[model samples]
Target: MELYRDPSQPIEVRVRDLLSRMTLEEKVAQLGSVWGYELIDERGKFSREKAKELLKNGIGQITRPGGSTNLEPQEAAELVNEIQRFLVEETRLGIPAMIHEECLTGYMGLGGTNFPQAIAMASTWDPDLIEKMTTAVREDMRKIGAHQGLAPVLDVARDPRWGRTEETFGESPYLVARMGVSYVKGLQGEDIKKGVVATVKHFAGYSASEGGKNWAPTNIPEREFKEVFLFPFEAAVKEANVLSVMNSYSEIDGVPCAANRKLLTDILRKDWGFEGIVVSDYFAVKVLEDYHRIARDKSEAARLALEAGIDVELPKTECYQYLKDLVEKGIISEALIDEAVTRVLRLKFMLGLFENPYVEVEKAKIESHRDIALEIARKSIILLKNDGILPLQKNKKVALIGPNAGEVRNLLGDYMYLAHIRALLERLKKSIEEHMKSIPSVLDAFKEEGIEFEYAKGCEVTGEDRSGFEEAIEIAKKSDVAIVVVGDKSGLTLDCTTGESRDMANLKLPGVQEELVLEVAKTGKPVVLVLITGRPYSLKNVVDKVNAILQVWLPGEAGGRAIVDIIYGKVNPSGKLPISFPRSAGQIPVFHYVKPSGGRSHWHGDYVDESTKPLFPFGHGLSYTKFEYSNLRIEPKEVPPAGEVVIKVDVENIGDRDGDEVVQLYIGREFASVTRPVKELKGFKRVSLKAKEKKTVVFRLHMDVLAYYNRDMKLVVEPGEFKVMVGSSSEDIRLTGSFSVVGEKREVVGMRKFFTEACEEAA
Candidate 1:
């Protein structure tokens, strides 16, 4: 066997061997991808005749094989096998194409386990849980012959107006990083040969776009950008050894992220030592010319992207096709092309695609992860408010009203199969409404539990029509309690209030949903508002009026089951707020990690029109059972700049019911060389406790956790006094202590710890 085809050889040796034997066109072809539809017939059959043209030189990736077509796991696996066979038999190099798909919420195709959405997953604040969730995701993706999963969006959501907030971990850098690293670990697994490559995406600063709009120009200060936006990417790259990165479509400072050389090459590769392939977002390379207008033509776009270290172009190539010509004409060097192709081939070799590219059609199954999905959905449900009205009273009469109460599509996030299929069908000017596959709805879940509850479409998620309001109000009037399910629909369509490119001007419940909530509240019955939304909205008008509120953020395919269980007290609500709910759109950038002067409104910190407080702060979540936090201790009160400090706190489940408490540890720099967040979440642990059970949560603070990019842009930990606080939520500190770093201010040279060391023990 050839050295490149030899399984015994090292991946690097195989990569070098493959490069030495490839022609110019072969090398260029390995750097571009084709959408799976490009090789399929009108009947959605794999057409080898079509592949003869598309795969004559081989391909870098097969984009969304199951997603591009309406295929189940078996059919998708069959198609993948046939396609891989064609590449191995027909192509001169006998190379296998990498199969990549959107697995953000499971496999992003039919018959795979749909876990909780990213925002909901973050609310769990359980990194190990997320790791298991992604491990299940890995099994589903690998079962379908998929090699890469475009998931675990690491963008620190800085603005709620951004439609893609649902896709992120949340506003806290520390939280996003911890979740992101686990996501990477879970998806990538122990080895790439038996695992799927996890793509930590949109690079840096994509979520902080201006006006909270998708793909808009971002204007973050240099220091804040690195500290907040780049922190997660750094951890994912360095800590998890993430294998792939997708470029953002947004422009930052003045340059588009697609062509940001300083970001893609210098910071990602050199500084953090990310030895991963950088793939462009779909059509993002063309976006350079059409959107950013920096490149005069496609030729210039290709050169700029390749030179900036984007190893591949994905979801169909538009720009990188010019690389062969650019290299031939001496406009770009062959060495750069070789560099990128080397990474791609190295990845393929690492995936063991050369020997085991085909998947077994009969072995397709996601049964193992079904329970995992339900658990994720269960933990993801957050009780925002409860006035002793939850564990829902043995209902005299319950009226479930609102558009979100009965739609399976609304329960899913943006990248899932049904949501994307509907969006695509809408773009084709056809309706998926008649034939779309569906799971149970909140109404269905209610019926399944043998409860007879009345439901009404009080009003649509959008539109001014109140045609159903009278009927809804009538049912609510006769009922003892009303459950109003309201929130944005997640998609890229005009009707969708959340998801990519669906930016909103205001954060209030979309259309007449706020008005609908009031209409339901007017019935004199206790009101329970269930928000099945993508982002936190302005809840100013409905806060005090509701007896309880549940922030059930687009929980996944198992969502209805999870919601029903939480409502009936079958599962205690433990999820905390990943992102804060603002009082109004004016508080667009509200967060718990604001600098000392960032969130200041006036002398008393109040706006003329409103207070600067979030409707619910980060780490805020109410439990059916209450918990008490006390006994704060800081061991060895002083440490060297590079040393560690142990912080301990006692937490007791004081209520009669058993539940989990998200023990949050925050640090505030009393004095520093630079300004810092008033309260930054340094450590956290979600410990399950029985009634009156006490647990001591310990957080090992490596002083390097406080490192910041200085004025000279060097990572350094400053020696200063710091306050350590233990809290149930950012705004609800229950215990406080202090520590000081006594040594000189030292720059982080080689070693730096990203996450806090946390453990739980009996108190």
Candidate 2:
């Protein structure tokens, strides 16, 4: 079985060939990674000796080299090529190891262009644009000869307190699926790339962590986990043909996901027929031994993961290094190891590493991929609240205040590599001072508008530094208006203000930053609060006081320009709220799509202390123009089992400015064995309209798209009456019509899978 030799053979044939060549020990070796400990590059360098030693031993993947090396594109690619060449040429079998990099935003590499964070991308509700953005990132990774990218985080953002909310698409399950498939189609390529595979992450129920705590135990019901958290993975794999998946570092139903065969194998592999690689999150195998304590030792931990369909141990392998020994003692089987190795080998062959073992040395293409990052970043910065004072006159004296006013590091998230963060930040600051040569900053963007401003360091993001506040307030008083910038700083592990351990006991602006904003507001002058944090915070007080609020979620190097553009009306802010902004810290776990009666009650069932409605509903945003929906249209008004309907709405922009409006299409089931959302997002269209322009947006709805997992745990389209609501936001339906599902129920089997791109592209 020589998978690498045949370019024209069916993928299954190649897989079978490679699957037949390995011994039990070789197979087991392929199943896990050669382990390495996490390292940081404070001096912006890598340890050649350390990298060599690690590569000398056969390994499955290189984990986070871009993070560890902390190099810009040229340097990052050179370092990666060096390591990849060493592994491919030096290893006995010449089996080139897959290289994995974090790419949550942009490439997640040093000097890699950062774009909008996950929530912002979700807010755009433009999956096509998201796909195009990821394609650029994929091109960058391909140029580096990197084999796998850990991104397109599809975890549906549900709980705001969940620190990883910044990593998800949005709160809606359908939106997550749509965006994920788009990302996968781009990164994995219309077909699998010549040198890369896309890895969908946190396999199941990771976002449902209890209390919104990082790595906390998940307490979601089995049904909810399948329908909501796991839906995106299914879509990415079945529809987009995603090549890899990473295990959730979570304990579901009191069992860690790493050890849950029901999910890893039964559902993911068997039920869905996912014939791709399944890898573990960093040290999740060890977590089973040390943290979950489900396994007595590393050996047992390795055994459980192997049996549960985990084919590769990621971010390095510790327990996996012991698998062959376990097999020698008859504890683990050769068949299981073979299964894992074939998947990895098949992907490597598909990636063309067998044909081109040498990594490229192209420094010229570094900026070739940057245009996508800049464009997406521009579209993602949402002006959450603005009173007409924006698009400021540049010549007016102004005060730029707060710790993040000119800081570049605050432009990235905590998981970013330090060197990349530092360099990107440096570039960001320069962009601001130069009035955004890369893009335009608020001040520079308004140069034509004749806006001017002053500067002050009002407060540190996470400290009680009021030393600069009085001066900042003075600057604010002297200026016509004040632009106060504040947000999180990206750091690694525990050292970061916003990383895995950066989880907070409460959601608030860190240190005295909020107080600083308040003090400046007391000047009785116009204050524009610009938030650049990783995740959404409780901005209730800030919203009430500030003349404007801009939630710029880790916009990359072009961040200042994007913010400035939105602030000054160069670009209308159509970015919606992907996650709800809570009114109070007490209202933790707040989200928009719960069953109408689920949250502490509303109206007759409303909670006593507070309202159940999200401070800002999901898909909420502002546009320069107003849109009106008319001619509530529906097809046939009723349909039989497995039938389809056409839902259309004519939207008109009545306002003065040309702007984009996201026309949302939703479907509601009047009755179900399992209570459903009043209506869920079935489709959406982001349309640009000129002033007074009118156009019709149509949604081709199928019964299959309307189906949901029932009490029996099988996806089914139940016979029932349905409502079609077209609107601006999830809660703001402007047009409504009724339809019915007639005849018998339809079980979603083959029909429920992620359909091919040819079908997707057709629409």
Error of 1 at 632 (Å): 1.2
TM-score of each: 0.98, 0.91
Compared with the true structure, what per-residue lDDT tens digits does model 2 show for residues 73-156?
666666666666666577555566677787777676545566767777777778888888787777777766566888877777
The TM-score that candidate 1 achieves is: 0.98
Residue-by-residue lDDT tens digits, candidate 1, 350-392: 8989988999888866454768778888888899999888988
lDDT winner? 1
lDDT (0 to 1) per candidate: 0.87, 0.73
* CA shift of 391, model 1, Å: 2.2
Note the clash tally of each candidate: 0, 22
Model 2 misplaced stretches (Cα beyond 4 Å): 1-25, 34-57, 71-90, 193-195, 363-365, 394-396, 419-450, 493-495, 600-605, 753-763
Error of 2 at 347 (Å): 1.2
